[PDB]
């Protein structure tokens, strides 16, 4: 019984939602009381740069973007069982941090 | 409160050292003196116990002379060393709030100091060009 906090953040929403659903399921069936998920406001990383590699022509601009999403869930259970739940439920697109 | 009053109304266009018009409020009439600004005149008129709602004509000789003394002896009336002019005088190191004819005397002195030593700023004053590093390619036509 620890107040474990998991924080999920990734640039691609499908996999992040899959990870949040997986932890919700593996904290449900393994009967643990859970307090989420909670969605932080999305972060839009904007780089606006000139299209031309020289300085000629009409002044036209590109607006590139990298979105970031962040979800948090709080778990109330022993440390090792939540650790194993986190360890099985990974994905290349979505990085994790378990903290107390 | 409006007051009916006469006699003391001298519209005399002659005031201290220069022809300061009497129709203008005292805070700003002193700004005619070269060396005195709105804020310096405002602070002097405060230190001389002159209600600023009184016009330059409405004043009398006691206020005039107190203003002269407070303007020419700023320290003696608690004017801070940062509020006056020509701080740390180049000649003697004192704080001198320089006024009308001394103002031109000291400007001539500073400029001639710069020219005699052959400083770049003095040489540019000599040519009539801007000294503070501004561009003159396009905007010094006048």
């Amino acid at each position: 019984i620890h107040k474990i906090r998991i924080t999920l953040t990734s640039t691609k929403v499908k996999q992040l939602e899959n990870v949040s659903a997986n932890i919700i399921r593996n904290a449900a069936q393994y009967n643990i009381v859970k307090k989420g998920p909670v969605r932080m406001p999305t972060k839009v990383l904007k780089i606006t740069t000139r299209k031309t590699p020289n300085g000629e022509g009409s002044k036209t601009w590109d607006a590139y973007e990298m979105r970031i999403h962040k979800r948090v869930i709080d778990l109330q259970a022993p440390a090792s069982t939540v650790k194993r739940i986190t360890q099985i439920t990974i994905e290349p697109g979505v990085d994790v941090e378990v903290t107390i | 409160l409006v007051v009916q009053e006469q006699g003391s109304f001298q519209h005399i266009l002659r005031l201290l050292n220069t022809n300061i018009d009497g129709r203008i409020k005292i805070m700003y009439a002193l700004t005619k003196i070269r060396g005195v600004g709105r804020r310096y005149a405002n602070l002097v008129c405060k230190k001389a116990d002159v209600e600023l709602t009184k016009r330059a004509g409405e004043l009398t000789q006691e206020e005039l002379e107190r203003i002269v003394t407070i303007m020419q002896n700023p320290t003696n009336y608690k004017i801070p060393a940062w509020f006056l002019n020509r701080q740390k005088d180049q000649v003697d190191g004192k704080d001198y709030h320089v006024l009308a004819n001394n103002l031109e005397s000291k400007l001539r002195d500073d400029l001639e100091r710069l020219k005699k030593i052959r400083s770049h700023r003095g040489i540019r004053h000599f040519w009539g060009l801007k000294v503070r590093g501004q561009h003159t390619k396009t905007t010094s036509r006048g």
Binding site: - | L1, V2, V3, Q4, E5, Q6, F9, H11, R23, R55, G57, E58
Partner: protein, 72 residues
């Protein structure tokens, strides 16, 4: 510099101000300035005075517009 206004309240002028202002349906800073050749800093205080010792009554009060009508 023109328009040669009046810079102080004066006895003859004060007789003028007392005599003429009850014949005005509308008085304000501008009305006094252009029917008295006084300045504005005098017109404002004349309106205030005549407000205390009643000679002019107000319709509206504002910093930028003073509206004043006949006392009667």
């Amino acid at each position: 510099d023109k328009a040669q206004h009046i810079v102080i309240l004066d006895q003859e002028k004060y007789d003028r101000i007392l005599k003429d202002v009850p014949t005005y349906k509308y008085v304000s800073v501008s009305v006094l300035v252009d029917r008295l050749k006084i300045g504005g800093s005098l017109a404002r205080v004349a309106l205030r005075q005549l407000e205390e010792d009643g000679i002019i009554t107000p319709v509206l009060k504002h910093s930028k517009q003073a509206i004043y009508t006949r006392a009667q």
